[PDB]
Amino acid sequence: MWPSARFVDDNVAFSRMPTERELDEVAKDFDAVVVLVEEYELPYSLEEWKKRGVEVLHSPIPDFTAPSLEQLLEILRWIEARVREGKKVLIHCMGGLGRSGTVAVAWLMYSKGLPLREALRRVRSLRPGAVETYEQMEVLKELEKFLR
């Protein structure tokens, strides 16, 4: 297993950016990748995944910012679609874990129904530093109100 990945359930993990020499290593374990950074901050083309047969959701979120609620729900629905087909999904931004940690917390909330306080504690137990900003916290609170 690519040891930088941390799983929040059997099928969904989050990590830092894989480097180019790690792409086969990721493709072996993950059939889908959610890429939360703009192309300009990547050191390879996302075509690298296509030639490996790995499905890609490219949904950029600017550095240190939160996704909109609609963007977050689109990402969650896509992750659910892949998990329903039995694939494993890797979520990543850069090296920080604000954006990727936000999606990981949201996934526990969306897929398991965990309350925000428990989903947050769980993901921060995996990587202290998941969910960096007040705005990232606020979109998670909006997600909770949407789910109920």
Residue numbers in the entry: 1 to 148
Sentences from the paper on this structure:
In each case, ShufPTP adopts a canonical architecture characteristic of the protein tyrosine phosphatase family, with particularly close structural similarity to its archaeal relatives TkPTP (RMSD 1.1 Å) and SsoPTP (RMSD 2.4 Å).
We observe three distinct P-loop backbone conformations, which we designate “low,” “intermediate,” or “high,” referring to the relative position of the loop to the substrate binding site within the active site. Remarkably, the oxidation states of the catalytic nucleophile, C93 differ depending on the structure, often with multiple oxidation states observed in a single structure. The relationship between the P-loop conformation and the oxidation state of C93 is unclear, in part because multiple oxidation states are often observed in a single structure. In contrast, the phosphate binding loop of ShufPTP is highly mobile, taking on at least three distinct stable conformations, a feature that is highly uncommon in P-loop containing enzymes more broadly, given that phosphate binding P-loops tend to be structurally rigid and follow narrowly defined geometric parameters. Mechanistically, the active site cysteine of ShufPTP is readily amenable to oxidation, a feature that has emerged to be an important regulatory mechanism that links cellular tyrosine phosphorylation with signaling by reactive oxygen or nitrogen species. ShufPTP exhibits a higher oxidation rate than any of the previously reported values for PTPs, with a kinact of 65 ± 5 M−1 s−1.
